[PDB]
Amino acid sequence: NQQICDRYGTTTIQDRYVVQNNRWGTSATQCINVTGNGFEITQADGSVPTNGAPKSYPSVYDGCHYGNCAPRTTLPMRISSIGSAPSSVSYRYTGNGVYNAAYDIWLDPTPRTNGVNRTEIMIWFNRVGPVQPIGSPVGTAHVGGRSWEVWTGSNGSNDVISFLAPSAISSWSFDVKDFVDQAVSHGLATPDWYLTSIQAGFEPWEGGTGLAVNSFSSAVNA
C-alpha cells in the first residue's frame, strides 16, 4: 500500500498501469492509497463549484499523459490501425460526496505523448450530486450495447465529448474503440488521428473519501 498526497504524485500497478493523484483543480489536500490492483481516495479535502471544473481526476491509465507513460503501452496508436481497445473498470461508490466516476480518453492529430491533447472523450459511469459534463447535450447514442446521453463542448483548452450513463454502472468491460469511433463521427477526430491514453477514475467536486477503483485493464491491439 502506497499513500500518495503530492499534487501530481504517481506510481504504477501490475508493472503495467500508471496511477495518478492528479489534483489539478484545488490546493486543498487530496490523497490516494494505491494497492496492487487499484486505489482508494483516502483524503479529499475541500470543495469547488459544481458549475465549474472539479477538484481533480485521480485515476489509473494506459498510454501517455504529460510524458508519463504506462509500462509496455502500445499507445500512441493511429486510430485506423486499432483492431480493438478492450478496457475494463470496477468501481466502489459512496452515498456521500459530489462527484462523477469516468473514463478520460485522449485523441490528438499527432502521436502525442506530452502536452494538452486536442480531443477528450469522457465516459461517465456514475454521477452523485448535481454534476454535469462540459458543454451541452446533443442527443442520445448507443455504444457498446448501452445507451448514453451525449454532450459536446470545450473546456477552453481542448474539445470534449462526454457520454453519460442513465444510472450507476459499477463495472463494465468494453471496447474503447467504439467510443473513439463516435468521436470521429461527431467531427472531433479522423481515422488518421491517434489514441494517446485510456484513463479511468473519479472527478470529485465535494468530498470523495472512500471512493475506489477496484480494478482496471486496458489493451490496444493492432
What resolution in angstroms, rounded to 1 decimal?
1.5
Is residue 122 within 8 Å of 161, Cβ to Cβ?
yes
Query: 125: which 3 cell numbers?
Result: 459511469
Residues 6+ apart with CB under 8 A from 187: none
> In whole angstroms, what is the distance from residue 115 CA to residue 76 CA?
13
Q: Which residues pair with 130 in a beta bridge?
A: none
Q: Between β-strands 212-218 and 39-44, what pairing exists: parallel, antiparallel or unpaired?
A: antiparallel
Whether the CB-CB separation of 94 and 129 falls below 8 Å is answered with: no
Provide the b/e sequence for 46-80 (b: ≥16 CB within 10 Å): ebbeeeebbbbbbbbbbbbbeebbbeebbbbbebe
Half-sphere exposure (Cβ direction) of 165: Cα atoms closer than 13 Å: 20
What is the distance between the alpha carbons of residues 148 and 164, in angstroms, rounded to a whole number?
A: 5
Experimental method: X-ray
- Going along the chain from its start, the domains and CATH numbers come out as 1-222 (2.60.120.180)
β-bridge pairing 119-128 and 159-164: parallel
Are the CB atoms for 34 and 93 separated by under 8 Å? Answer: no
CB 47 within 8 A of CB 29: no
**Catalytically active residues, by annotation:** 120, 203
Rg (CA), the chain: 16
**Strands of the chain, DSSP E:** 2-4, 10-13, 17-20, 30-34, 39-44, 59-65, 68-69, 77-78, 86-92, 98-108, 119-128, 136-143, 146-154, 159-164, 171-175, 194-206, 212-218
Cα–Cα distance measured from residue 160 to residue 20, given in angstroms and rounded to the nearest whole number: 21
Query: Sign of the C-alpha dihedral, residues 155, 173, 143, 181?
Result: positive
In this structure, the strands spanning 98-108 and 59-65 are: unpaired
